[PDB]
Curated annotation (Swiss-Prot):
The gene is BRD2. This is Bromodomain-containing protein 2. Homodimer. Interacts with E2F1. Interacts with (acetylated) STAT3; promoting STAT3 recruitment to chromatin. Interacts with CTCF; promoting BRD2 recruitment to chromatin. (Microbial infection) Interacts with herpes virus 8 protein LANA1. The chain holds residues 346 to 455 of 801 of the full protein. Chromatin reader protein that specifically recognizes and binds histone H4 acetylated at 'Lys-5' and 'Lys-12' (H4K5ac and H4K12ac, respectively), thereby controlling gene expression and remodeling chromatin structures. Recruits transcription factors and coactivators to target gene sites, and activates RNA polymerase II machinery for transcriptional elongation. The first bromo domain specifically recognizes histone H4 acetylated at 'Lys-12' (H4K12ac). It also specifically binds histone H4 acetyl-methylated at 'Lys-5' and 'Lys-12' (H4K5acme and H4K12acme, respectively). The second bromo domain recognizes and binds histone H4 acetylated at 'Lys-5' and 'Lys-12' (H4K5ac and H4K12ac, respectively). Disulfide bonds: none annotated. It is found in: Nucleus; Chromosome. It comes from the Eukaryota.
């Protein structure tokens, strides 16, 4: 990985770390719409994304730059904000994990 992609991988490891598990866990794996009874999920969310998918893409050297990695992380949060009512606990959790992401992503090495 390039320097910027190592910074992205560091962020990814932090997002998956025990430090943030209390609010990161809804984003660890793909939303299982059928299991959760969310039968409209895939009609509203056209491009599902989660941290396990981001990790697989990083491991596969799919991301060619930091911007591509950040786009998937933000897509994951955006899906949450689109589907979920703003007062659901999952939205509060998304906001908290996005704050961790955005503040560390901003410290990207030049
Ligand atoms: C990314 N995860 C989700 O969007 C998600 C979505 C829902 C969910 O049921 N959304 C429904 C919208 C539309 O109708 C009401 C709201 C539930 C969960 C999710 O994650 C994990 C889980 C199980 C959870 C999370 C935090 C607290 C408790 C339970």
């Amino acid at each position: 990985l390039s320097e910027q992609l190592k910074h992205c991988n560091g962020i990814l490891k932090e997002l998956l770390s025990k430090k943030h598990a209390a609010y990161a866990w809804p984003f660890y794996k793909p939303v299982d719409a059928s299991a959760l009874g969310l039968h409209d999920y895939h009609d509203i969310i056209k491009h599902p994304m989660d941290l396990s998918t981001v990790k697989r893409k990083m491991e596969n050297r799919d991301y060619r730059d930091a911007q591509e990695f950040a786009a998937d992380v933000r897509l994951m949060f955006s899906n949450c904000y689109k589907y979920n009512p703003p007062d659901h606990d999952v939205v509060a959790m998304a906001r908290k994990l996005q704050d961790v992401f955005e503040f560390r992503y901003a410290k990207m090495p030049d």
